[PDB]
Amino acid sequence: LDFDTSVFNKEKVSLAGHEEYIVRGGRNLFPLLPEAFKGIKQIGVIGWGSQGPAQAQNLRDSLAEAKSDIVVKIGLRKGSKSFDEARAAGFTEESGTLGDIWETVSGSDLVLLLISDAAQADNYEKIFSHMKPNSILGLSHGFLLGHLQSAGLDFPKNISVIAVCPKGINGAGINSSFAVHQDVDGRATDVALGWSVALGSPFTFATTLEQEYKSDIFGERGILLGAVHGIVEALFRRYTEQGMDEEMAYKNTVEGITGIISKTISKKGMLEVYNSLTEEGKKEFNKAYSASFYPCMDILYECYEDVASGSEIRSVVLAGRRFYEKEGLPAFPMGNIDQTRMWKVGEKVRSTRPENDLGPLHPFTAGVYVALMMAQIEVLRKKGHSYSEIINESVIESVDSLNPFMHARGVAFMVDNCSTTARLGSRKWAPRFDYILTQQAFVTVDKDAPINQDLISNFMSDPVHGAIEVCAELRP
Template sequence: MQDQTLDFETSVFDKEYITLGDRREAIVRGGRHLFERLPQAFDGVRQIGVIGWGPQGSAQAQNLRDSLGNTVRVTVGLREGSSSMQEARAAGFCEQDGTLGEMYEVIAASDMVLLLIADSALATLYEQVFAALRPGTTLGLSHGFLLGHLSQIGAGFPTDVDVIAVCPKGMGASVRALYVQGADVNGAGINASFAVHQDRTGHATDRALGWSVALGAPYTFQTTLHSEYLSDLSGERAVLLAGVHGIVESLYRRYRDQGLSEHDAFRHSAESVTGPISSLISKSGLDGLYRSLDADGREVFADAYSAAYPVGLELTHEIYDEVRSGNEISGVVMAGRRLARFPMGKIDDATMWQVGQKVRADRVPSEIPLDPFTAGVFCGVMMAQVDTLIEFGHPYSEIANESVIEAVDSLNPYMHARGVAYMVDNCSTTARLGARKWAPRFDYLLTQQAYPAIDSKEPVDRTSFDAFEGHVLHDVLRVCAELRPSVDIYVG
């Protein structure tokens, strides 16, 4: 079980409490009106070094630069000769004004270092990074992977620096897109969690909150670095990525077997999940999606949910065990050593994903079906992840964001625009490895256990659905929806 005794003090931002179910959590609401407080939050920080130009590094460097203006210099640090140098220059960072440089030089010169390189690189390079940090500086992470790796090998962070985390609950492209799209809408952006792992300067909390506000987070909630990596790694291996991948592949085959054309099978599976189902959950929650169905649709939803939930619960528990045991972290580190020889292939040449390209090209949004069977399967697996994280004591804000909000407000809209296969082939290495490992498990168990239970002559056991309508998640999502920005992400 995780420790639920979380609270924080800030001298810069306005802390408030929200009630989620039977718990009270402290948060900070974001907004561009708070940018004027950022110099105070970063008091003593003359330079923030953003190390890495992956999806998070590029998005966060640009958001921070745009929010901070001339008050704090934001400098990007990359490996000597990195192919990303030109991309950073194109975004306005350059060597001549000191906003682009070699990573270790940037680390040594920065008062706050945001380490946003790939997880496998973190495992390889952390000693050199730590050696380059000056005492009294702040080390920032956007993922708890490094803590998990250090714990496994019996190492730790330097004791003379702050260690904080700000973890946006969305992919890097969403972090940048919503910030830009919401330029005229106060509070538009991606939610984030924050954690203070070490506070040696006494400024760690305000710097973490300032970082989150500067990224454009509509609201920032508290977690621990340990809790974050358990929920984040588990979530992307479950419903956020691997789960949705396995769900739609299993449904596509099922609908084809039932006689639907390739085009219609894709519309009733992947298009339905990433389109109307995700949109309804985003605005109205899982219970709102269920209530939107007619009487016959609710019966179909209930049976599909009841059959899919046990599969989701079993697999999410297994995934969680693999993450907290260190097996998933070890697997990522070992894969990092193999990838030069055995690079990951793409999945988008498979028939289903080729069909998907044609479907998206001919898409009429108003004609995408809200399939109640698809909705029930998706929500059953999603709620199973929620219940797993509740059982292991994670904060409700973290559970809602890692299981629902990140999916329907960040990841699924990208999948809707470009395809589930695109997401699986273009996300972080850690997530791509997880999707390839766990998606087949969701696919197989749904196909082998959930769907036969529905197709048998016996009534489906609805025990799991009996808890659905009164579930605490619905109240949690309603409160979170009040903090949601009015801007929906647009993916061109």
């Protein structure tokens, strides 16, 4: 994946022998922003949720630093309860920095669409109709493209389409991936890079908008949320079936994965989880890995293709409309996932858990979790994704961002604090991982099947372990 920026220097990084170009950020580059934002006199930031504040705030702040005349204006829908906070952050109508969504769309040369996935699906026509011809549409995530492609549609051909997507003391910040879907004049690459740099992205990786939404929507159904919830439920049931006390069962699954296993991967990667077990523990690890890799891949492979085909995005869109009454049927908002046995048990463990506790490192649990991680990697790898995307979505974000939430307060605190699309995916696919492990992986172990040494060998020697090291040095 190449790109062409006339403003910024791109640097090469090598990952498992695969060269990726990246662009480093820095407040020292803010002087370069007016060059990057050529032709833009207004940036409209639509929506003020979790990204609205930070993005608008950062964009306005970095542009002032460069002494730019560019106006950062928020547009909010009629009925938004964020008008007040928008004013609190200095974005007001009298200053011309706040207004109605449509009015704001009409006047912006760059439209950053930060509204929810459901809002984008229900409003893309009106957004397109209000945008200036030849302006730029900016997305933090590629859901909309997937929605349009699921209907055989694309964006209007008169607008540029770019994406700056987040992946999560000199050098602080949050890395981003950027994509240029359409570029009507040749400014797209520089406006997306400037947008990333303006946000404080220490690193901006290159991707395609199609790969972003595929990797993102699939990743959250896999190890990030769906799969880890499924395998944790499967093992809790197995361990308790085998007589292990409920609390140690919880600690040997959730506490282990979200704590010591996560921290171990974060520091020294997957190979140091195995190397940290006793000799007897390595053997249990390999039994679990050898039995769990392909079952996990089964579901991951199925989930990826449903996301890439358009089936899953259509399902997400329709699921969202079922949250409200229609066609004479009841409303079915999302329910609670944390009121079952194992999470009521998990509530007891945490009440007396000491601070900075990391739980026991159960070799079997480790083998299952690492098998799932390696299976996700292989699926994305053979589906054509770059190592930066693969690692930054299958390893870093789960062990460094999401798993701490589970360790903190349980599955719901992790899942239901994510996007609606992610919350739906976790509920739809966690049961799938639970069943296949129980029906296949655990049957293989209970058959006393021998260890698949090809898998183990491939695990020990997988190039991704070395790429994960390089990528680790890229984190902020």
